[PDB]
From a paper:
The human KCTD family contains 25 soluble proteins that share a conserved potassium (K+) Channel Tetramerization Domain (a subtype of ‘BTB domain’) at their N-termini and have variable C-termini. The BTB fold of the Kv and KCTD families has a roughly pyramidal wedge shape and consists of five α-helices and a single β-sheet made from three β-strands. Here, we present novel X-ray crystal structures of the BTB domains of a further five members of the KCTD family and examine the stoichiometry and stability of their multimeric assemblies in solution. Overall, the pyramidal wedge shape of the KCTD family BTB domain creates a versatile scaffold compatible with a range of oligomeric assemblies and geometries that may impact function.
Author numbering: 40 to 143
The structure:
């Protein structure tokens, strides 16, 4: 029940530590002391990424699955972040959803 507050490109998020370390992701690396992380005076963990889909990322780490968006752009936007945070399961789902739109 240890909590964490993240500032993802101006997007403010509150989440638990277990969620951030529940899967083998780059976020798990941050909150286990394997990579240098920057924090402001407010105690917010700063991340230089768009937080547009970050809530969706947290849902995947938390629940293990999430309903994906419909448009090819948003799937692309989500896929980009899933790749940045190294969330293997979500990247695959986004890839399958994208190839399904290509058919056709
Ligand atoms: Cl579309």
């Amino acid at each position: 029940s240890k909590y964490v507050k993240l500032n993802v490109g101006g997007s403010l998020h509150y989440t638990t530590l277990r969620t951030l370390t529940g899967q083998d992701t780059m976020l798990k690396a941050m909150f286990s002391g394997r990579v240098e992380v920057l924090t402001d005076a407010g105690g917010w963990v700063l991340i230089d990424r768009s937080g547009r889909h970050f809530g969706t990322i947290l849902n995947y780490l938390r629940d293990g699955s999430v309903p994906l968006p419909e448009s090819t752009r948003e799937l692309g936007e989500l896929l980009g972040e899933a790749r940045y945070y190294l969330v293997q399961g979500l990247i695959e789902d986004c890839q399958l959803a994208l190839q399904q739109k290509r058919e056709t």
